[PDB]
Design a protein around this ligand. Structure first.
Ligand SMILES: Nc1ncnc2c1ncn2[C@@H]1O[C@H](COP(=O)(O)OP(=O)(O)OP(=O)(O)O)[C@@H](O)[C@H]1O
Ligand SMILES: Nc1ncnc2c1ncn2[C@@H]1O[C@H](COP(=O)(O)OP(=O)(O)O)[C@@H](O)[C@H]1O
Ligand SMILES: [Mg+2]
Ligand SMILES: [Mg+2]
Ligand SMILES: [Zn+2]
Ligand SMILES: [Zn+2]
Ligand SMILES: [Zn+2]
Lengths: 212, 664, 426, 162, 300
DNA sequence: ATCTGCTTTGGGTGGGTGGGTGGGTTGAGGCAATT
DNA sequence: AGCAGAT
């Protein structure tokens, strides 16, 4: 019919399952950060699917140069040095949503199963992040088994966002400081999850074709 | 020859020589070719009849001083497939080109139309693919989508700046105007001349404004999975689209799915997630039309200039007043009185304000008081399908403030406000109440004022206002004990009281009696209907033809044509009583009163004297006649007198029928 | 440059406009300055007749030329009253077609419009500045500013080193005027299908303040403008004239708004030997019979007379009427007529009402977090008549909440600190 | 003609001596207000002082004085504040409401804000009928500063009681 | 156009005899055609409906150019004409045609044998209102006359619509007939002037046009207070603004002779005292014999 | 190393196109469900 | 006033 011009590069995802062991929510510690493991919990809330910036592409405001494949950290990121030798722009850019690649993104909140709660104890909770085709695979009230990587998410408000003014434990949750971006503020952290797989524990012609 | 003025061909347009579709469309020569092809499509397209569709659509557009040309997606897809593909994938630039070409086509017919409206907005009607608010993903970004939902929150109409002009704080130079994107603000960081990092002041000698409004779309309860929470999105309605949709209404929004940067969203989520909105391009009212989904256009109750040159042949014929009654719920076997009452209520009377001091209701209310399996709820559902604006309510599923209006505290402004209920949604429409006799007494007494004065008065939480509820009520009820007792009077067979009963223009009592011949006909008709409706019993043209053949068997007038006809009659025709036999009406009214003096009989008041005239006006309206005729008054008198006689007891029914035979 | 010529043109209209042998505007100005009413009401049909060019300017750019017609009026007033005075207000009258409240949109921004509506709320008067005296923080340099209330002004940003914003206002040497805010709702009949009535914010200046009360139909001539409170602006109307069918000023104060010629007509009508019959027949001409109820309605509209005894006891002077009867009797129609004939009236349904809806309700301001009082049906109808339809559907408590206001004609409140005894003579 | 009520007070009466009658509906708490501070320079052995003024403590406009206590002498000596010799005065704000029985037809009563300083601080309680004499004033910038973008808000006003 | 300078540009076209004749505004197609014309001319509907004084001045100035190209297409070209306009300093300018219309409206609705005498006395009274309106010191009377003229034209339009929708006009071989018996505003037509106004309206619309043969028309109206008819013969008129040899010749009114002959021959009880001999009064029960004899006379 | 410039507390002298999982929390009034 | 940035 026609020659499609928009054939970008697939964004593959690797999903692992069938790990030897499955961890409870209460057994998540900080020694396993950045490692691959599975956890089990009953979903309680699910966010809405939003587009997440993955490979931003900007253009220089003055010489109209282009920057492609700008890996994005937990906060909005822009280039610091134009590739044009004659250019002097360092902190002036405009995003280009046509060339930018976005990924789906959903936030799922889970809590430990009832039978695993010590008697008369409030439940523990966690926030799981799904991406790509693993979105909307968990409905509230289900007992799922996520498999991903335990990560730590910084408080992006302190790190410095465009157009955002920065800002249980009785003041003892003091973060780390001294970073260049953090002038006089501190950076506090949270434990999160990045699932790559989800399992939920709990017309004649068309029908015939399905059967063996 | 200037290279910028050269053009390609259609096949040369199908093969793309850019890295993205937007860049392909934006090129000069490609844009010229696309504009030429769109103009050719507008000028040359012909439907089956062979007459131009969009020439007539432009003529009517100019007639009404409107600035919106409705274009069918299917027509464009058939005439030009590549252009439809481009519009689907890159809607912004394609819509810009199509607006320019549409203005050029409109100026063809009205040379100086630029003096009425500067621009014409093209509206897409039937996008083949429909999404939900749960099914929207990143792949749909910057592409045309069609979604449904319920307008749960609306804002006032604000004049937005079409062009913003900036001036340097230091240099003082004034930058040229720049197009404003409703999705997000426009800012200038690097000045072309001053080259100053400092902000530039926002100022302008003269600007043109456009209307702006925002609505919060929410998933309709019908589509959301049972028990789950509903998703929602935000839609931006620019000029000519503001106030088309109202709170509490279903809608079908066609627009562009767009995303922009939001700092707060990134701060709360912790990831660089953008905010998404829909830029509305058209709206279709889906409320109360669940049974009309098989229909083209953004309005299914609107007419061309050729469909109302024939609603006026159908109506000069001599028996339209009775082919219309036949076409009311043809899938119901009998019940001629019920169908006549329903038709009268659908067409309705003419409201009149005498000297600006006296207000007289102009709508007809009907009550069906029958036995269990007598096709009442089906009639109510049909009336819901056919009426322009209808709302369905059931006995205990409705509240006193659910009908009429309620008072809430706005979550945003934290100030008391007023919401419209069923009767407000049924303004200039029909409110169908089923299980009328099982309602709560408190809820039932709420509609008294609305059923006669056509207004709702609220004095609550510092609000003192009166609304408009110009709605007719068709209610179905079940007699005491579940089965009508013909030996007792009507008053004893229902729990309603005189004030509520007197507000119903027509009372239709239905009885289920075992007559072998009557049972024979009804069963034959029902079984034939079940055979007819069986699912198994060009492709679109063939489907339409078979549907038409199936429909013709039981309805003399097509249902869609009938809907358009009823809407046209209710909009454009206001019959007036000039020549009438006063003595006849006076003498029938006096007879009705004297015969109704009996205890337990159906109440008779001046309301029914006025109901006779209302029904006569409705019958005159059915013929698209500007003056009420003697035959119409005779028919209305017959309707009222019969409806009165049928409600009598068995013992006196024969005497009453003999006494009233003069008028029937 | 052009401003002086425009001012000269509007000054020649006030000094040269004669329709016969009387200078209408020169004489109107002198008569107004003599009673201390510094304003001039000009009819726009007269300006279109003197020079159509002057009307073209006043209609093309209203917020720029109106300020230059005020100074012309002031100069002429000085010439006429002072033998060698604040800036005079200009009130406009027009007969142009009225735009429906909901038809006002981006096409009418910064233009003179005429519209009608119902006033639902009025604000406490504020004070706007008209002549500021300023001084510098550092070098103590004195200056003055002059402001007209027509927006498209702030203190100078740089002195005349002195940091940014160096000027502080000297209040004991400045002059201010009056400003009021009004909410305008569209007429119930104008509202489109299935739509709630829509509001619009309005502001008036000086001699156009305290001219209306909530619940009265008015006609407004003004400028449809916008003020910034992203790229959207909240519209509002800058009033240039108010016309009403209710003499609110007479009703609040003494007897006023009756011309001697108008007063003579009323005495002549009173002298009619059979005025009772005429008034009885004039109520509900379209309702047959029910003569006794119509006489009762005449008596209710007329009212009795109230007495304040020396010891302090007050005797009610109003008449309350109940209509109990069968359906179809035309009680609701009589109530809807009485609501339309009485100078002040409110039509309410007993079912769609509440104890707080009647009387007064306590409300919290979302900003100041402070409770205040808002009047209900019986306060909004004070000095008039309340038509409570469907009186039998009203709940027992909401009906009990009416006894004191019906007999003693007062609404005692004791809620959220607020403790008062309002007045409801209905 | 200066005998008025909270309803009849208009912009025409600003900067004038008026007498207002009504009901006291509110009464803030009494808080001392700094006027003069006296310090002692130990090395120099001499006392210094500073004078503070506000918009509500005087009738003639002056430059505002932040309440920061001086810490260093002109020559750099350390200064220790002497609170026992400083001067603070009491300050209270009340609201006076129009008499309900004197209000117009169908209008709720209005109110005005009043300031009482020094010996007039606790002479009234809510629910009392009073006649207040003072000077009608205006305060602040009233939206003339660029921070407030409204452009449709007036100046604050109130009475300094005598 | 009907009172162009004292009403909207829309109302002047809507309530004009010539425009209604050439567009058939009494039915919906006519309104659609008029709206199409306004849209083509480049005048917004809101602008057209605005009153004359406050109308946008660009369109008011261009009206001569806009009308001249656009009108010929719709067949309304003869609207263009030259007339007399009189202005008194600083007052609105009024044309001769509108002045005459105001005077006539003041004459018509300005305000057994006993009732007839009372009606004639009332008309004699209206004469003096119309006479006063001729003095420049009396301008309120002229404005009052313009308002009444607009009201009367609206009423005539409604009555003509009712007559044409019902097809009350009987097309006999000698003449056309139209008798009103139950109209809504039948008290208006007791005055010969208002009856002639309605007659002219009918004569122009669907009688002047349609390419039908010229036939005189008879118009009658009833009044229950006196149970009698006010018959009024009307001369036919050639298509307006069509200069021709046959159009040059004038057409006479023969109804006086036939009416007198029939009255003398039959025991008619007709009153022929009106100055216009074509207008008489008949009793309720004599109209049928009178019209039968009229048809059989053949002298019409 | 010096000069230039923004923003608090928390509060309506920033707001409701930032919201209430960013805190400012009693009081009144309307509505459904419970009676 | 403390801290964040440009010359
Ligand atoms: N003279 C009249 N007498 C009675 N009803 C009349 C009269 N003229 C008109 N009506 C009709 O009365 C109807 C209005 O109802 P009405 O006010 O009589 O009810 P109500 O008796 O007060 O109320 P409800 O029936 O609820 O007790 C309108 O339809 C109006 O047409
Ligand atoms: N006269 C009739 N013609 C056709 N179908 C009928 C008729 N009477 C009853 N039915 C059947 O009854 C069913 C609807 O019953 P319904 O009207 O809902 O009962 P109710 O009157 O209690 O609401 C339909 O399936 C319809 O086919
Ligand atoms: Mg049912
Ligand atoms: Mg009633
Ligand atoms: Zn660069
Ligand atoms: Zn610059
Ligand atoms: Zn200075």
């Amino acid at each position: 019919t026609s020659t499609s011009p928009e054939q970008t590069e697939r964004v593959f995802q690797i999903s692992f399952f069938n790990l030897p062991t499955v961890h409870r929510i209460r057994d998540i510690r900080s020694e396993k950060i950045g490692s691959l493991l599975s956890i089990s919990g009953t979903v309680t809330r699910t966010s809405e699917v939003r587009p997440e910036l993955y490979k931003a592409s900007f253009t220089c405001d003055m010489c109209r140069a282009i920057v492609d494949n700008v890996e994005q950290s937990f906060k909005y990121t822009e280039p610091t040095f134009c590739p044009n030798p004659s250019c002097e722009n360092r902190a002036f850019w405009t995003l280009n949503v046509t060339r930018s690649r976005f990924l789906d993104w959903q936030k799922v909140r889970i809590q430990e199963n009832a039978n695993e709660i010590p008697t008369g104890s409030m439940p523990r909770t966690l926030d799981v992040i799904l991406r790509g085709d693993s979105v909307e695979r968990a409905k509230p009230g289900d007992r799922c088994k996520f498999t991903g990587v335990e990560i730590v998410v910084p408080d992006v408000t302190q790190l410095g966002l465009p157009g955002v003014k920065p800002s249980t434990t009785e003041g003892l949750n003091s973060g780390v400081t001294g970073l260049r971006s953090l002038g006089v503020r501190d950076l506090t952290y949270k434990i999160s999850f990045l699932a790559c797989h989800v399992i939920s524990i709990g017309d004649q012609e068309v029908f015939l074709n399905s059967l063996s | 020859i200037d290279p910028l003025r050269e053009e390609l061909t259609l096949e040369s347009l199908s093969n793309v020589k850019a890295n993205s579709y937007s860049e392909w469309i934006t090129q000069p020569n490609v844009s010229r070719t696309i504009a030429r092809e769109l103009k050719s499509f507008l000028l040359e397209y012909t439907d089956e009849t062979g007459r131009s569709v969009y020439g007539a659509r432009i003529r009517t557009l100019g007639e009404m001083n409107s600035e919106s040309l409705e274009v069918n997606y299917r027509h464009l897809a058939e005439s030009k497939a590549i252009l439809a593909l481009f519009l689907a994938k890159c809607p912004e630039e394609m819509l810009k080109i199509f607006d320019l070409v549409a203005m050029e086509a409109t100026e063809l017919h009205y040379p100086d139309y630029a003096r009425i409206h500067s621009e014409i907005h093209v509206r897409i009607s039937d996008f083949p693919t429909i999404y939900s608010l749960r099914e929207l993903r990143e792949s749909n970004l910057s592409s045309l989508v069609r979604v449904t939902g319920v307008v749960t929150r609306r804002t006032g109409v604000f004049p937005q700046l079409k062009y913003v002009k900036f001036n340097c704080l230091k240099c003082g130079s004034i930058l040229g105007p720049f197009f404003q994107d409703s999705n997000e603000e426009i800012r200038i960081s690097f000045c072309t001349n001053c080259k100053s990092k400092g902000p530039f002041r926002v100022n302008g000698e003269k600007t043109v404004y456009r209307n702006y409004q925002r609505v919060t779309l929410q998933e309709a309860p019908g589509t959301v999975p049972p028990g789950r929470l509903p998703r929602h999105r935000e839609v931006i309605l620019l000029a000519d689209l503001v106030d088309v949709s109202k709170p509490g209404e279903e809608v079908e929004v066609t627009g562009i799915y767009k995303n922009n940067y939001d700092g707060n969203l990134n701060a709360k989520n912790g990831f660089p997630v953008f905010a998404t909105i829909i830029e509305a391009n058209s709206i279709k009212r889906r409320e109360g039309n669940t049974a009309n989904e098989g229909e083209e256009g953004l309005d299914v109750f609107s007419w061309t200039e050729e469909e109302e040159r024939e609603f006026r042949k159908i109506s000069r014929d001599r028996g339209i007043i009775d082919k219309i009654i036949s076409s009311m719920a043809p899938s119901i076997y009998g019940h001629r009185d019920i169908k006549t009452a329903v038709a009268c209520s659908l067409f309705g009377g003419v409201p009149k304000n005498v000297n600006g001091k006296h207000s007289i209701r102009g709508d007809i209310n009907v009550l069906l008081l029958g036995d269990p399996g007598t096709a009442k709820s089906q009639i109510l559902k049909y009336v819901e399908k056919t009426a322009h604006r209808a709302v369905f309510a059931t006995g205990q599923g409705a509240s006193a403030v659910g009908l009429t209006a309620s008072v809430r505290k706005d979550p945003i402004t934290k100030e008391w406000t007023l919401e419209g209920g069923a009767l407000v949604l049924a303004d200039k429409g029909v409110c169908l109440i089923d299980e009328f006799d099982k309602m709560n007494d408190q809820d039932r007494t709420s509609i008294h004022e609305a059923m006669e004065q056509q207004s709702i008065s609220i004095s609550k939480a510092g609000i003192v206002t009166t609304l408009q509820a110009r709605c007719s009520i068709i209610a179905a009820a079940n007699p005491n004990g579940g089965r009508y007792n013909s030996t007792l009077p009507l008053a004893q067979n229902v729990s309603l009281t005189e004030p509520i009963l007197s507000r119903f223009d027509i009372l239709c009592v239905v009885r289920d009696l075992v007559d072998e011949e009557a049972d024979e006909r009804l069963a034959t008709f029902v079984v034939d209907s079940h055979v007819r409706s069986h699912p198994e019993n060009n492709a679109r043209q063939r489907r339409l033809q078979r549907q038409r053949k199936k429909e013709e068997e039981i309805s003399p007038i097509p249902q869609e044509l009938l809907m358009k006809y009823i809407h046209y009659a209710r909009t454009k025709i206001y019959p007036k009583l000039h020549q009438m036999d006063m003595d006849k009406v006076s003498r029938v009214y006096a007879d009705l009163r004297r015969e109704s003096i009996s205890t337990g009989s159906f109440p008779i008041t001046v309301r029914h004297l006025e109901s006779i005239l209302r029904i006569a006006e409705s019958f005159a309206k059915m013929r698209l006649s500007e003056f009420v005729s003697s035959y119409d008054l005779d028919r209305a008198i017959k309707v009222v007198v019969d409806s009165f006689v049928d409600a009598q007891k068995v013992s006196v029914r024969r005497q009453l029928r003999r006494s009233f035979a003069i008028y029937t | 440059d052009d401003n002086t010529e425009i001012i000269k043109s509007f000054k020649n209209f006030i000094l040269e406009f004669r329709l016969d042998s009387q200078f209408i505007y020169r004489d109107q100005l002198r008569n107004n300055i003599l009673v201390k009413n510094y304003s001039l009401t000009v009819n726009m049909e007269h300006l279109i007749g003197y020079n159509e060019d002057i009307y073209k300017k006043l209609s093309d750019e209203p917020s720029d030329i109106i300020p230059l017609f005020e100074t012309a009026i002031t100069q002429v007033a000085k010439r006429i009253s002072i033998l060698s005075l604040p800036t005079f207000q200009l009130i406009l009258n027009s007969n142009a077609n009225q735009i429906p409240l909901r038809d006002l949109d981006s096409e009418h921004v910064s233009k003179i419009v005429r519209l009608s509506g119902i006033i639902i709320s009025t604000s406490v008067l504020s004070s706007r500045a008209t002549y500021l005296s300023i001084m510098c923080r550092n070098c103590r340099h004195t200056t003055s500013i002059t402001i007209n209330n027509f927006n498209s002004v702030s203190l100078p940003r740089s002195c005349l080193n002195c940091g940014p914003d160096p000027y502080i206002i000297i209040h004991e040497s400045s002059k201010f005027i009056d400003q009021q805010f009004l909410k305008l709702q569209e007429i119930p009949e104008l509202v489109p299908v299935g739509e709630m009535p829509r509001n619009l914010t309005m502001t008036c200046d000086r001699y156009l303040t305290n001219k209306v009360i909530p619940g009265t139909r008015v006609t407004i001539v003004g400028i449809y403008s916008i003020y910034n409170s992203v790229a959207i602006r909240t519209p509002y109307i800058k009033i240039l004239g108010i016309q009403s069918d209710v003499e609110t000023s007479s009703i609040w104060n003494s007897v006023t708004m009756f011309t001697e010629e108008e007063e003579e007509e009323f005495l002549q009508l009173s002298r009619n030997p059979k005025l009772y019959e005429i008034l009885t027949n004039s109520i509900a001409p379209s309702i047959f019979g029910n003569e006794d109820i119509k006489k009762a309605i005449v008596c209710l509209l007329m009212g009795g007379s109230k007495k304040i005894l020396p010891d302090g006891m007050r005797l009610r002077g109003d008449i309350n009427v109940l209509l109990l009867g069968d359906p179809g009797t035309a009680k609701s129609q009589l109530l809807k007529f009485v609501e339309k004939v009485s100078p002040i009236a409110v039509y309410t349904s007993g079912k769609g009402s509440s104890a707080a809806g009647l009387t007064a309700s306590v409300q919290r301001d979302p900003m100041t977090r402070e409770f205040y009082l808002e009047g209900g049906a019986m306060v909004l109808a004070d000095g008039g008549v309340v038509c409570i339809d469907e009186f039998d559907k009203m709940r027992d408590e909401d009906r009990v909440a009416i006894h004191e206001a019906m007999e003693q004609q007062t609404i005692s409140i004791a809620k959220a600190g607020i403790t008062t005894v309002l007045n409801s003579r209905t | 003609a200066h005998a008025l009520s909270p309803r009849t007070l208009t912009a025409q009466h600003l900067n004038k001596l008026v007498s207002v009658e009504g009901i006291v509906t509110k009464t803030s708490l009494v808080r001392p207000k700094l006027i003069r501070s006296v310090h002692y320079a130990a090395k120099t052995g001499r006392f210094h002082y500073r004078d503070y003024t506000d918009a509500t403590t005087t009738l003639t406009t002056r430059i505002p004085t932040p309440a920061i206590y001086p810490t260093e002498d002109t020559e750099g000596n350390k200064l220790t504040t002497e609170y026992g010799y400083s001067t603070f005065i009491d300050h209270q704000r009340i609201t006076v409401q129009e008499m309900p029985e004197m209000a117009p037809a169908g209008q709720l009563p209005r109110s005005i804000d009043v300031i009482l300083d020094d010996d007039l601080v606790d002479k009234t309680k809510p629910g009392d009928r009073v006649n207040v004499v003072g000077v009608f004033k205006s305060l602040g910038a009233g939206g003339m500063n660029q921070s407030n973008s409204n452009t449709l808000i007036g100046f604050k006003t109130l009475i300094l009681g005598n | 156009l009907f009172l162009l300078r004292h009403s909207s540009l829309y109302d002047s076209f809507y309530y004009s005899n010539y425009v209604n004749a050439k567009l058939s505004l009494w039915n919906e197609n006519g309104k659609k055609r008029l709206h199409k014309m306004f849209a083509r001319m480049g005048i917004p509907l809101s602008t057209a409906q605005e009153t004359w004084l406050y109308m946008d001045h660009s369109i008011k100035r261009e009206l001569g150019i806009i009308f001249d190209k656009n009108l010929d297409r719709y067949g309304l070209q003869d609207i263009i004409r030259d007339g007399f306009v009189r202005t008194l300093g600083y007052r609105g300018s009024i044309s001769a045609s509108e002045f005459v219309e105001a005077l006539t409206a003041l004459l018509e609705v300005g305000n057994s044998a006993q009732k007839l005498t009372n009606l004639r006395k009332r008309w004699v009274s209206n004469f003096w209102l119309s006479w006063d309106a001729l003095d420049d010191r009396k301008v309120e009377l002229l404005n009052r006359g313009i308002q009444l003229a607009q009201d009367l034209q609206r009423a005539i339009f409604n009555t003509g619509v009712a007559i044409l929708e019902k097809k009350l006009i009987k097309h006999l071989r000698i003449y056309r007939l139209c008798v009103l018996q139950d109209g809504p505003d039948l008290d208006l037509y007791r005055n010969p002037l208002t009856l002639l106004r309605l007659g002219n309206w009918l004569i122009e619309c669907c009688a002047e046009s349609e390419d039908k043969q010229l036939l005189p028309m008879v118009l009658a109206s009833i009044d229950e207070n006196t149970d009698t008819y006010l018959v009024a013969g009307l001369t036919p008129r050639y298509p307006r603004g069509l200069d021709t040899i046959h159009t040059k010749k004038p057409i006479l009114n023969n109804f006086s002779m036939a009416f007198q002959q029939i009255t003398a021959e039959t025991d008619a009880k007709v009153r022929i005292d009106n100055f216009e001999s074509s207008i008489i009064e008949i009793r309720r029960e004599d109209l049928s014999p009178f019209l039968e004899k009229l048809t059989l006379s053949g002298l019409l």
